């Protein structure tokens, strides 16, 4: 899953 | 206490880029940093101890409750009662291991739509004593990364992990349109001030605009980094775009020029215009909440938080800001004029 | 190279004291921190390595040479090319160990008067590329803490360690009068914008005004700590006063109200108005150079130096600020508008 943090 | 302005200065951080262009530092007009509807400062007034990283925040209208999206659930906090240290309710939305990524209120405040790392968007009736699920929208994309609601309340747009923008008729929970174009996750979304155009950002380094009546892609802007956030100026003309590269860029809609703003040291995770349109905020993985003058980006205030700032919202009267944190909480600020 | 403003805020530090005793935080007008001739940034452009604490600084008019007074020696620095950063001449005292307290140029840049912790004021001829001492004015007072020159150039006022103000005829090199009244060292001095009133502060906790024609003391203002510095606003009406308690007080001339400003943690050692009168600076034992809006003291900029800031001057063109340091140096700042 893309998670930018 | 009463606070007073005190001017600071930095190496030039705000640049105007012309058609050429040709980047010149911006000479700020007299009402860049001060004026009617321009905040003097912001004061932290609550901390909401969600206990998971807060990927999404929304404030009720009237302002009274805050919704924080963490892992598995949305928590509802009554900020009108000062002493509360715990939510007044919890909305269990998806697998306890998966994050809520976006939540939005309908214009009239009675329903919340929640999306996240799952293929279903839940729709919550907020009138019913204890809040309850009214309906679900079941996408075929694995995740939703961002939601937007139409100003007439009839449609929800979902930014899908496959790049598609899903358009849902809320009445009968039917996908009525799908905007295809982004070749990697669509990360962010807003609607133009006249309600007729959609603007989306992607992990394919583009911002796209879409005609809502005709159904087609209109414009594409290609960037040298991924887009994480965006916001359309409610008084029109300007689109703010926050980048993985740490830039904020303010694009002049259907025009040659733009501003580039440089006060983050890391990814610009989220952004939101004030309702009056005269200023906006950006939040960074560098822990900063920055306030900016529209369009040219004079720095009105800065607030450094304890951890990355993933999410934000501004209340309908521009009196409060709420941010969501990598330190597993949300922060409520009062905007002081 | 280029700089931009960025607004900040602090707990209320500027208060207005009215004739009826009330003390309220000042509501700043829209041009408190912004406007033509209001600095946006002070850039350190030169360090002048004198090698003794710099108790006195002055700048030629036209701007070109800076004079730094230390222990035993005034150094001369050419800030045109260079500034950076070696002296072009130096004026040595007979006693290497005598501390300099004040130096002032005559309007035509050809004469420097030098005073300090000794019984003589030296007058230096600077006309014929090499300096020479041309006159010594000999005091009964063991020390001079401050000098002022009359606008017509005929007279030098010397603040004596015994409280007296010695009035020296410069052409005839003779003592013409004494302004007697300070019951402890006079520390500071300025002339009113019409040129008719003398203002002095002392270690007796008083500011006093004097009628330059009559010779008579006019006003007296008693304070609860020692006065270390003062400045009269060149466009009139306001007298800034720097105290040992850390306050800067801005007195309304001939009126019963004043401002109290609180951004120093220690003694206010020196102070100077800009020539346009619209802002001024004060310097602290706390290492701060603070710039202040006239009269209510909105904080335009702060710069924290490496050591105590003992002295300052502003050039007649308002383009430069020079401060003298406890770290045995002076700093040249370019004022960025």
Does B228 contact A4 at a Cβ distance shorter than 8 Å? Answer: yes
Q: Which 3 state secondary structure label does DSSP give B240? A: strand
Tell me how far apart the alpha carbons of residues B106 and B110 are, in angstroms, rounded to a whole number: 7
Using CA atoms, how far apart are residues B217 and B198, in angstroms rounded to an integer?
Answer: 9
Query: Which candidate in B94, B145, B160, B204 is best for mutational testing of the A interface (most A CBs within 10 A)?
Result: B145
Q: Is B298 within 8 Å of C13 when comparing Cβ atoms?
A: no
Residues 6 or more apart whose Cβ sits within 8 Å of residue C27: none
Cβ-based neighbours of C222, under 8 Å, separated by 6 or more: C205, C206
Chain B residues touching residue C26 (CB < 8 angstroms): 4
Q: Which residues does chain A have within 8 Å of residue B267's beta carbon, measured at their own beta carbons?
A: 4
The DSSP result for B13-65, as a single string, is -EEEE-TT--EEEPPPPTTSSSSTT--SEEEEEEEE--SS---EEEE-SSSSE
Across the interface, whether the CB atoms of B3 and C26 are under 8 A apart is answered no
- Give the closest of A1, A2, A5 to B285, CB-based: A5
Contacts (Cβ under 8 Å, ≥6 apart) of C21: none
Contact A1 B98 (CB under 8 A): yes
For C2, residues 6+ apart whose C-beta sits below 8 A from its C-beta are B11, B12, B25
Question: Quick check: B14 contacting C, CB < 8 Å?
Answer: yes
Does residue C308 have a cis peptide bond before it, meaning omega lies within 30 degrees of 0?
A: no
Report yes or no: B36 at the C interface, CB cutoff 8 Å.
no
Q: In angstroms, what is the resolution?
A: 2.1
Q: Which residues of A touch B246 (CB under 8 A)?
A: none
| Shortest Cα distance, chain B CAs vs residue C39, angstroms | 10
Neighbours of C213 (CB within 10 A): 8
Q: Do chain B and C touch: 3 or more Cβ pairs under 8 angstroms?
A: yes
Task: Tell me, yes or no, if B119 comes closer than 8 A to chain A by beta carbon.
Answer: no
Longest alpha-carbon distance in chain C: 58
User: Are B285 and A1 an interchain contact pair (Cβ–Cβ within 8 Å)?
Assistant: no
> Which among B98, B185, B308 is the nearest to A5, CB-wise?
B308
Burial of B23 (0-12, 13-18, 19+ CB in 10 A): middle
* Chains C and A make contact, 3+ CB pairs within 8 Å: no
Are C165 and C156 a contacting pair, CB within 8 Å? Answer: no
Q: Given a contact as 3+ CB pairs under 8 Å, which chains touch A? A: B
CA-to-CA dists, residue C158 to B272, C3, C103, angstroms: 61, 41, 11
CATH of domain C1-337: 2.130.10.10
- Minimal CA–CA distance to B45: which of B55, B34, B59? B59
- B71–chain A Cβ distance below 8 A for any pair: no
A vs B: CB pairs below 8 A: 26
Sign of CA dihedral B221, B224, B230, B232: negative
| Residue ranges per structural domain of chain C | 1-337
Give me Rg for the CA atoms of chain C: 19
Q: Are C66 and C56 in contact (CB under 8 A)?
A: no
Q: B298 vs C41: CB contact, 8 Å cut-off? A: no
C250, C252, C258, C264: CA torsion to nearest 10? 0
d(CA C1, CA B329): 40
Q: Which of B2, B5, B299 sits opposite C32 (nearest CB)?
A: B5
């Amino acid at each position: 899953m893309w998670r930018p943090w | 206490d009463y606070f007073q302005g005190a001017m600071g200065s930095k190496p030039a951080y705000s640049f105007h880029v012309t058609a050429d262009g040709q980047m010149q530092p911006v000479p700020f007009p007299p009402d860049a940093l001060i004026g009617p509807g321009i905040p003097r400062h912001a004061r932290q007034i609550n901390t909401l101890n969600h206990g998971e990283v807060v990927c999404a925040v929304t404030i009720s209208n009237p302002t009274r409750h805050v919704y924080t999206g963490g892992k598995g659930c949305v928590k509802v906090w009554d900020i009108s009662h000062p002493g509360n240290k715990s939510p007044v309710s919890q909305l269990d939305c998806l697998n306890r291991d998966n994050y809520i990524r976006s939540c939005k209120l309908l214009p009239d405040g009675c329903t919340l739509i929640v999306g996240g790392e799952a293929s279903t968007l839940s729709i919550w009736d907020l009138a019913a004593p204890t809040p309850r699920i009214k309906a679900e929208l079941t996408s075929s994309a694995p995740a939703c990364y961002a939601l937007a609601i139409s100003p007439d309340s009839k449609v929800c747009f979902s930014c899908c992990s496959d790049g598609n923008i899903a358009v849902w008729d809320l009445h009968n929970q039917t996908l009525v349109r799908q905007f295809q174009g982004h070749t990697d996750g669509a990360s962010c979304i807003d609607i133009s001030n006249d309600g007729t155009k959609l603007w989306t950002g992607g992990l394919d380094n583009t911002v796209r605009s879409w005609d809502l009546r005709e159904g087609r892609q209109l414009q594409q802007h290609d960037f040298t980094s991924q887009i994480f956030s965006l916001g359309y100026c409610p008084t029109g003309e300007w689109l703010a775009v926050g980048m993985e590269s740490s830039n904020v860029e303010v694009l002049h809609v259907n025009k040659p020029d733009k501003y580039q703003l440089h006060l983050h040291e890391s990814c610009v995770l989220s952004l939101k215009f004030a309702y009056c349109g005269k200023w906006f905020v950006s939040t960074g993985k560098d822990n900063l909440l920055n306030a900016w003058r529209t369009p040219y980006g004079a720095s009105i205030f800065q607030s450094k938080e304890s951890s990355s700032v993933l999410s934000c919202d501004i209340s309908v009267d521009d009196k409060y800001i709420v941010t969501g944190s990598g330190d597993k909480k949300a922060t409520v600020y009062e905007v002081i004029y």
